Symmetry: C3
Amino acid sequence: AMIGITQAEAVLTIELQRPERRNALNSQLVEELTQAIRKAGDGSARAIVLTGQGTAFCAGADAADYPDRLIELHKAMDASPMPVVGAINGPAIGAGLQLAMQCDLRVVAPDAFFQFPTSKYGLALDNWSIRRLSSLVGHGRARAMLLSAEKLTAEIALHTGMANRIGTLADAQAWAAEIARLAPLAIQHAKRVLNDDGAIEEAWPAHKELFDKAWGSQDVIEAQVAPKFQGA
Amino acid sequence: AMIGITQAEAVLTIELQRPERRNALNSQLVEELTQAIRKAGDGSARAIVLTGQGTAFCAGADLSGDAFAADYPDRLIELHKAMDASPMPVVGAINGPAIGAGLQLAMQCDLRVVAPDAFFQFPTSKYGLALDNWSIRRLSSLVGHGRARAMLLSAEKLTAEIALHTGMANRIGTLADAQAWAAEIARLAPLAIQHAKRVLNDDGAIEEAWPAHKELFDKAWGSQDVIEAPPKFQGA
Amino acid sequence: AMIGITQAEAVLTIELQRPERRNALNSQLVEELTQAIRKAGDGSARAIVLTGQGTAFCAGADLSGDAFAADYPDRLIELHKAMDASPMPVVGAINGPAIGAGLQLAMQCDLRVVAPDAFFQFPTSKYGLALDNWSIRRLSSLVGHGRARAMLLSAEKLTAEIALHTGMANRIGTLADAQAWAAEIARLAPLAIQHAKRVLNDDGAIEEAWPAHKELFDKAWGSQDVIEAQVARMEKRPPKFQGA
C-alpha cells in the first residue's frame, strides 16, 4: 500500500509511494520495504532499483518500534546478495539520506540534493551515517554537511562519487539490467567487503554521551517551535 | 602580544600576529593561541574564526630565538588538543600560504575558507623531517590518498583551486566570507555540532605511530640530512 | 628476458617487456620484476619509474603456458611485499590500460603519471572472480568509495581524465614526464620519503580478509560461473551466469 513493486526481466523496481509526504519513512513503509528487499531474491531478479514518487526521493522520518524497524531495513539492505541501484529522483534528507547511502550505487536526478539538517534541529546521528557520508563526499565536505547543514547538490554529488551518474529512473533501470548480467558471486563478495570498510561502527562512550545529550535536549523542542538555541 | 582577539556578536576571531615571520609558530605564539581557544567559550561566542595577519596564514615554525624552544612540541600538542576538544566550531580563514606546522594548524580547523592565492604544503621531504601520524591521516582524508602521496613524498603544493576540488577548502573566499559563514553556524544547535565534531575527529586520524613509524620518525629527526637542509642528502 | 632496466642519473627505469601479452603477468615476469625492485638501490638510484612496453601498462594475468603457474600467487605476494617494503619511491608511468592484476600493480606504485589514453579497471564481476581486501581498500582510497563501488560491482572503467579527478593519477603525462618528476624526487631526503611511504601504506588497506570475506572469496573462485565466463570468452558470446 505504501510501496509499488514491479519487475522487468531481471530487474526489480521498488517505488516509495508516499509522494504527499515526500516518501517519509513511517513504520508501515519501513516494514513493507524490508519485506520487498528480503523477497527480491525469489529471482528471476538479480538487481534492485529503489526510487521514490513525486518531487523527493525521501525527506526523512515521518512509532515506538520505528527505530528497531529502521535498523532491520538497513540490515536487510546490507545483507542482500543483490545490488541496489538507488534512482534518487529528488532530495534525500535525514533518514532519506541514510537510505540513499545504503544503496549500492546511485543514479541521481539533476534537481536532487543530499542533506543532514541535524545541526538545524539539534539532533545527532549514528556513527555509520557519518562514516559512510565521509567515504562518499570526502571528509572535508562531510564536515560542512554535518556541522553546518550544507546541501550536497546533484552536481557536487557526481563530483565526489555520491552520485555514480546523473540521470533518470530509466537510466538506473538500464544500468541495473547490465549489472543483472554480471556474475552474482563476484558482486556479493565485493558488496560485503565494501560494506565492511569500517563504516559500521559502534558509537564510542563519548559519542553516546553527546548523542543522548542532543536527543534529550530542550534545543530539539526549541527548533520545532521556531531559533534561540541554548546548548542544553 | 602575538595574537589579536576580537568578537562580533557570537563570532570570535583569533588572528596570528607575527607577519614579520609570516606567522611562523613559536612557543609564545602557540601558548597564546591555546589560551585564546580555551577562553573562547567564556564569553558567549558560538563560533571561532582563525586567521593570519598579512600575506600568510602560517608559513611553518621558526624557533629563533625562542627562549622556550624546549617547550614547543608540548605547546603544539596542547594547541591541537584544545582545538580538538573545543565545543565550538573553528572556521579557518586561510588567508595565504599554510605550510608545515601551518598546514597542520589549518587541518585542525573544523572548516576552511581559503583565499584564492593561498596554497597548502608539507615541505618535509625537502627538510628530511617526518610527520606525526595524525597529519598524514587527516591530510589523506582531506585531499584523498593519491594527492596525499604526492604532497608527502614530493612536497607538492596544493593550490586553493585544487583544495576546493578535494574538499580541503570548503569555500574559496576572504576573512569576511569566513566570518559571515561563522555567524550562520553560530545560530545552529551547539549540541548537534559538538556531537558531529567529536565523531568526525574520532575517524581514526588520531593514531599512535606504529613501532616501524616511530623508528623511521626518530631516524629522520636525528639524521645528518636534517642538519644538511647545497642540500645534497646522503640518506643518513 | 621479460624486463628492461635502464638508469639515468639517480632514476632507475624498469620496463615490463612482455608486450606480446600486453604485459599480462605470469610467474617469470613477476619474479623478474621482484628482483629488479629489490636490487634497485644496489646502484646509485634514489627513485624508480615502472612502465610497460607497447600499448598497455599491464592487461592482467596470463598464465598460458606458464610451467610455474601454480607458483604465481606466491610470486605475486612477494612482488607486492618487495614494492611495499622498498625504501625507494616508485613512480608508475601508466602508459596504457592497467587491468586486474595490472591495476593492483599500478596501485602499489607510490605515485602515478598516466597517459591520456590509459584506463584502469577491475573486470572481476565479468569473470566471476573475487579480489583480496587490499585491492578493494587501496582502490577506495584512490578513487573514493562511491566510484570504487561502481568499478567493483559493475566493472566500470576509470578513464585517465577521471583518474586525474580522483587522484588515482597524480598527473596526466608521458614516460619522459614521469622520469623528469622522478629525478626531482630523487633529490629529496630519502629518510623523509621512507617514513611517509611506510605510514601511508599502513593506513589500514593491508587487511586480512574477514571470515565472511574468505567464504565468499573461495565460493567465487570455486564456482561454475568462473568456468562459464572462460567458456563464453572462448566462444565469443555473452556468459550465462547462474550465481553458483
